[PDB]
Ligand binder design. Structure first.
Ligand SMILES: Nc1ncnc2c1ncn2[C@@H]1O[C@H](COP(=O)(O)OP(=O)(O)OP(=O)(O)O)[C@@H](O)[C@H]1O
Ligand SMILES: Nc1ncnc2c1ncn2[C@@H]1O[C@H](COP(=O)(O)OP(=O)(O)OP(=O)(O)O)[C@@H](O)[C@H]1O
Ligand SMILES: [Cl-]
Ligand SMILES: [Cl-]
Ligand SMILES: [Cl-]
Ligand SMILES: [Cl-]
Ligand SMILES: [Cl-]
Ligand SMILES: [Cl-]
Lengths: 258, 258
């Protein structure tokens, strides 16, 4: 379907972090990945778009394999540059940090990649940027401001609009609400829920079990670099089988994120 | 001064390994012990804190003798338990292996002995743990992770922070970089150099002659259980007298540690 990640491993030097994980997202799937800090969730997402290099595995986007070749360092690299670019355009990522260009206004930040990477006219890029900024609740008065002027919550909403304006096949999110004021978490989770309700294909790493249970079509529990349990949210959360998953669900209640 | 080890011998059963070695560390001394694998370096360090039992010798800490008595097995044991404990608190050790509690987070691992052994309040132990974890470059994001989540290099940095948090009189290190990825060795040697520059009293066994020559105030060449040559690093390395030391320095270049 849209994304198929097969038998992915990843090492940093000699330290193996991901030990064989797979994921398959079909159109409209909303996959939440949960697990302890250190289980390798961020490494998993960063390998999907090659921000990090896998040591083993395959990545297929829209049914087309992304050719990989073993590099100098013994890791896997994307053979063809266009497959890497094509890639970063069909999959977009929203991170814990906001990742906006400090010298560009909110509007310019959302217009930039559609122009520079997709080759769109300024008019077409502006129309997408206005559409998606409205969707995330960033109004005209805020559009001429710069990142330094905005709260973390506002910057993350702008980052979500930036990802949406690329009109990708899959949206990847790595704990997007983790650095936000706790009072602002709900609002961002609701924007992500609205995208899911509109049929977007999404992969989300999160500590907010409310979103993982309530919005996901599939939940993956990552444990020490492997998928220890996965399935429908009602099963994973309501009828956990693995003692490791049961312990994670109990312990997570007391951790303060925030 | 801080530690005086006198005429130490050690046998495993009938096999005599250490055959009369002495060491004296005054405040701020940085003593590196070098020699072939099998010369008895680890046995020497493990006797200092009684992880191994000497067959002959005396150990004096801060000018106070640790009373020893000949045991059932014919080896020497520390007579008084408090002298043994007091001991393990004034001297701390960092090993080739990391020695962290698998069920405790990084932060909990560094706080544990100051609470349990020293009797500190949780607050005082946490303040020491945050201080020393920062010193070894382990940030907040890594502090809530468990040993299984970390590379060897990270685990060793945490182990160094654990030793430092006891605020001991002498830090003992047995080849702390030997099991680390070669790319990570330098960084750990630099942390050890920073401790030396801050005036810490240290005894270090190592195959990294760069540290032994560049950072030590005194170098001991151990050969078949005895000190064959010792002195200032510029003399031991730049003007070796013993043909055994000369042969060790030449042969060591080709050994691969990795
Ligand atoms: N840049 C890096 N260099 C070396 N090792 C890294 C790096 N980033 C991550 N790691 C290793 O991968 C494991 C960590 O990260 P990941 O970032 O995959 O964790 P998570 O499970 O997503 O946790 P969190 O996001 O809470 O840190 C770490 O514990 C560390 O050993
Ligand atoms: N647990 C043990 N039981 C019996 N003999 C031991 C034990 N540990 C060490 N020895 C003896 O002491 C000599 C070894 O160790 P030591 O561990 O002192 O060596 P080193 O010189 O520190 O070398 P390396 O660390 O490279 O092994 C060995 O060759 C062995 O004969
Ligand atoms: Cl301003
Ligand atoms: Cl915020
Ligand atoms: Cl989140
Ligand atoms: Cl885990
Ligand atoms: Cl390592
Ligand atoms: Cl070393």
């Amino acid at each position: 379907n849209k994304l198929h990640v097969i038998d992915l491993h990843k090492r940093y030097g000699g330290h193996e972090v991901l030990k064989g994980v797979s994921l398959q997202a079909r159109a409209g799937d909303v996959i939440s990945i949960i697990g302890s800090s250190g289980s390798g969730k961020s490494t998993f997402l960063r390998c999907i778009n090659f921000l990090e290099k896998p040591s083993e595995g395959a990545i297929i986007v829209n049914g087309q394999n992304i050719n990989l070749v073993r590099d100098k360092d013994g890791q896997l690299k994307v053979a063809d540059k266009n497959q890497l670019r094509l890639l970063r355009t069909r999959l977009t990522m929203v991170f814990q940090h906001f990742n906006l260009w400090s010298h560009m206004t909110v509007l310019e930040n959302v217009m930039e990649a559609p122009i520079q990477v997709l080759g769109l006219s300024k008019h077409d890029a502006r129309e997408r940027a206005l559409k998606y900024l409205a969707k995330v609740g960033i109004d005209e008065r805020a559009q001429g401001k710069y990142p330094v002027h905005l709260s973390g919550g506002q910057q993350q909403r702008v980052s979500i609009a930036r990802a949406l304006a690329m009109e990708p096949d899959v949206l990847l999110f790595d704990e997007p609400t983790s650095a936000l004021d706790p009072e602002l978490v709900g609002e961002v989770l609701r924007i992500m829920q609205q995208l899911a309700e509109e049929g977007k294909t999404m992969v989300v790493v999160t500590h907010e079990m409310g979103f993982a249970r309530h919005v996901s079509s599939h939940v993956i529990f990552l444990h020490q670099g492997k998928i220890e349990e996965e399935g429908d949210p009602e099963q994973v959360f309501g009828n956990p089988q693995s003692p490791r998953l049961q312990q994670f669900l109990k312990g997570s209640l007391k951790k303060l994120e925030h």
